[PDB]
């Protein structure tokens, strides 16, 4: 299991970076951090492990509205609500924030773009391999 | 040698493309008539002869491949046979070089 | 003249295949069948001559609304009515069934497509020719 | 034209195909058919000449609207009306019946397409020639 | 067709697939199936012949609307209605169900696609031949 | 005939995977399963035959609304209803779930995509052949 | 599946990720997870197997809408509703959440993208092979 104090620091950093997460129960955030631990590599950026693991967890949480409320009804995970309006009280219309152009799934949220910039600076986005003989 | 003969035989291929040819019933009179017509047109083609095809449902194209370098390949095979056999090429290939007047006298005296 | 019994059978087959033609006088159907006789070839599909001649006549009749009523007014043969509406009683809007993509005039009605399928199966859509010497 | 009974047969065939011409004055149909006779070849068909004349006359009389009758002004020959409404009593909307992006001028009406098919079956749509001597 | 029980089985299978045909007059279904039998090969399937006949008949009866019944006029065979409203009581709008930009004429209805898949599994969609002698 | 217990298991699996099929009479489901049996191959995935035959039957049933109700009216098999509305009571608008991009007829419903994934994993989507000499 | 506690862990992980499944009947989740187990490899992950099973089940249950529960008719599986209003009281409009022009069938939901990333990190998205002997 990943170190408990590091998990506490990562969750607390996530809370300070996005203040709206202060109302979410800690078990769900712990589960999201543990899931995001499977992708983040340790020895690449050992100095700043907590910041980037928090960034990647935040990117996972806000990918396509993966994180909903506890009492959120089903069937909203596959269909979105474009607009609604009451008779003579109020009306509202929504839309998508940005539009992707590369199909990388990583340049889809600001946190993912921050994580890619950090990865490119610290180690790089390259991969060169040769056989073992 | 057999591969060389096959390569010569497959020097040129003509393909006849017809829209909706898969609807024809197998081994029925329509298919026999179609292939008989194809063969009959095939016999009468040539350099001085032309053919006519439809422009909306038919296409006629020719795919051709060249032949080159096989005589030297067969010559190399024969030279390998000569080298492994242990007998001179004049006796086994029954060939005269033709590029020199009286040098093969040394060849026959070596034999 | 084409055989009378064959014409009777072709018209009756046209009537059974499209029941709405039962209200049309017989002389117009006879004229349409005689006109369609000029295109259908006899020795190609001698076994099923009646079915395909009826199919081709049906394709000719419904090509672009060639067959209208006896009292249909002129100027409707060159102009179509997209929509109409009375004040507060009813309204209606029309449109084209399908849209062609090849300009063959034969893949424009279902009956023509049936006729092409039958022709391709029975004989074929090919034409190979050589000179006579 | 060479004699009269062929003209009578052609006009009768046109009226048989389209019953709406039973009300058109006879002289106008005579003029239209004798002017459309200039484009058709008698030696080509030589068996269904009257049918070819009737089809070509029908196609020629319906390109963009030419047989408009009397009392139709001169602006109707340069522009088309697409909509017309009368106060709040009724309304109506018109539109083009056929698209002719090919630009052959013969694939603009069903009669032209039928004439092209008949010509292709009878003689053909080709013109292959070589110089004399 | 060669005998009767195959016709009975084919009609029963068509009614089993689509229960809405239990009300259609029997003679019309007989005519449709015996006219759709002309396109199917008995030697190819030779085990599921009745299923192939039923699928092809269902596909052929539903291309653009052909089995419309009686009392449906003749304009319904050349144009389609897209909207209809009755005063201020109700309204309704229709539309096409499938797009067939491919133009195969067999990928226009689900029955045609199923028939193509069955033919591909049984024999295949190819036609490779060579000239005789 | 395919084994009765296997058919029972396949139908029951179809029922549990889609609970809305519990209200459908068993004979129609049996007919659909028997029709889908003609496409599914046995020796490819003998361990998981029931799951994939149920998946393929489900894909066939929901291809383009092939399975309708017992009392569903005709003419709805070729035309779809985009929208409807009563005067001052309610209104509704429909639409297509997804849009195909390959014309395979198999990547058109989620069940078909599941079946293709299973086929690719278990055996593969490849076909290499050579002549018999 | 090989034993029970892995099933319990997988279902618990799915409920932990999406709290909305705490109300879904348990048997449906069991069926979904044991049918989604067929596509995942145990030897590949061998450390986060339960996480992979949960992610794949969540992705498979949310492609186009499959886990719709009971009392949802059969038309909901072929068409989607885009708008609904009730007299002049309220109105609502829906729409698709993700565009998948790539056509991989795995980049359609966030769970599929996360599963692809996890597979790429663990083993890889390549398949390089050579013939035996």
Short mmCIF file of C-alpha atoms in Angstrom, two decimals, chain D residues 50-127:
data_model
loop_
_atom_site.label_atom_id
_atom_site.label_comp_id
_atom_site.label_asym_id
_atom_site.label_seq_id
_atom_site.Cartn_x
_atom_site.Cartn_y
_atom_site.Cartn_z
CA UNK D 50 -44.73 7.78 -83.97
CA UNK D 51 -43.79 6.78 -80.41
CA UNK D 52 -40.43 8.54 -80.73
CA UNK D 53 -42.08 11.68 -82.13
CA UNK D 54 -44.61 11.70 -79.29
CA UNK D 55 -41.94 11.22 -76.62
CA UNK D 56 -39.69 13.93 -78.05
CA UNK D 57 -42.59 16.38 -78.39
CA UNK D 58 -43.69 15.73 -74.81
CA UNK D 59 -40.12 16.23 -73.56
CA UNK D 60 -39.67 19.39 -75.63
CA UNK D 61 -42.94 20.90 -74.39
CA UNK D 62 -41.97 20.46 -70.71
CA UNK D 63 -38.33 21.54 -70.28
CA UNK D 64 -38.82 24.61 -68.09
CA UNK D 65 -42.42 25.46 -68.97
CA UNK D 66 -43.15 26.46 -72.56
CA UNK D 67 -46.73 25.32 -73.20
CA UNK D 68 -48.27 27.88 -70.85
CA UNK D 69 -51.32 28.77 -72.95
CA UNK D 70 -52.77 32.25 -73.38
CA UNK D 71 -53.12 35.04 -70.80
CA UNK D 72 -49.92 34.30 -68.86
CA UNK D 73 -47.93 37.57 -69.20
CA UNK D 74 -44.25 37.71 -70.21
CA UNK D 75 -42.60 37.68 -66.77
CA UNK D 76 -43.61 34.03 -66.30
CA UNK D 77 -41.04 33.08 -68.95
CA UNK D 78 -38.08 34.51 -67.00
CA UNK D 79 -38.88 33.92 -63.31
CA UNK D 80 -40.82 31.35 -61.29
CA UNK D 81 -43.13 31.86 -58.31
CA UNK D 82 -42.28 29.88 -55.18
CA UNK D 83 -44.97 31.03 -52.72
CA UNK D 84 -48.35 32.75 -52.66
CA UNK D 85 -50.75 33.48 -49.80
CA UNK D 86 -54.07 35.33 -49.60
CA UNK D 87 -54.48 37.30 -46.34
CA UNK D 88 -55.09 34.74 -43.57
CA UNK D 89 -57.25 32.46 -45.72
CA UNK D 90 -54.79 30.04 -47.36
CA UNK D 91 -51.18 29.68 -48.46
CA UNK D 92 -49.22 27.60 -50.94
CA UNK D 93 -45.59 26.87 -51.80
CA UNK D 94 -44.09 25.47 -55.01
CA UNK D 95 -40.72 24.08 -56.03
CA UNK D 96 -38.68 22.43 -58.76
CA UNK D 97 -39.47 18.81 -59.56
CA UNK D 98 -36.16 17.52 -60.98
CA UNK D 99 -32.47 18.30 -60.55
CA UNK D 100 -30.33 18.10 -63.69
CA UNK D 101 -26.75 18.70 -62.54
CA UNK D 102 -25.56 16.50 -65.42
CA UNK D 103 -26.46 19.17 -67.97
CA UNK D 104 -27.33 16.85 -70.87
CA UNK D 105 -30.65 18.76 -71.43
CA UNK D 106 -32.24 15.37 -72.10
CA UNK D 107 -32.16 14.08 -68.50
CA UNK D 108 -34.43 16.91 -67.34
CA UNK D 109 -37.85 15.26 -67.81
CA UNK D 110 -38.95 11.61 -67.65
CA UNK D 111 -39.91 11.75 -71.33
CA UNK D 112 -36.36 12.73 -72.27
CA UNK D 113 -34.92 9.84 -70.26
CA UNK D 114 -37.32 7.38 -71.90
CA UNK D 115 -36.40 8.75 -75.33
CA UNK D 116 -32.69 8.35 -74.55
CA UNK D 117 -33.25 4.76 -73.43
CA UNK D 118 -35.27 3.98 -76.56
CA UNK D 119 -32.57 5.50 -78.78
CA UNK D 120 -29.86 3.52 -76.97
CA UNK D 121 -31.83 0.29 -77.44
CA UNK D 122 -32.60 1.01 -81.10
CA UNK D 123 -29.34 2.48 -82.43
CA UNK D 124 -27.07 3.66 -79.61
CA UNK D 125 -25.63 6.79 -78.00
CA UNK D 126 -22.25 6.57 -79.76
CA UNK D 127 -20.80 8.35 -82.79
#
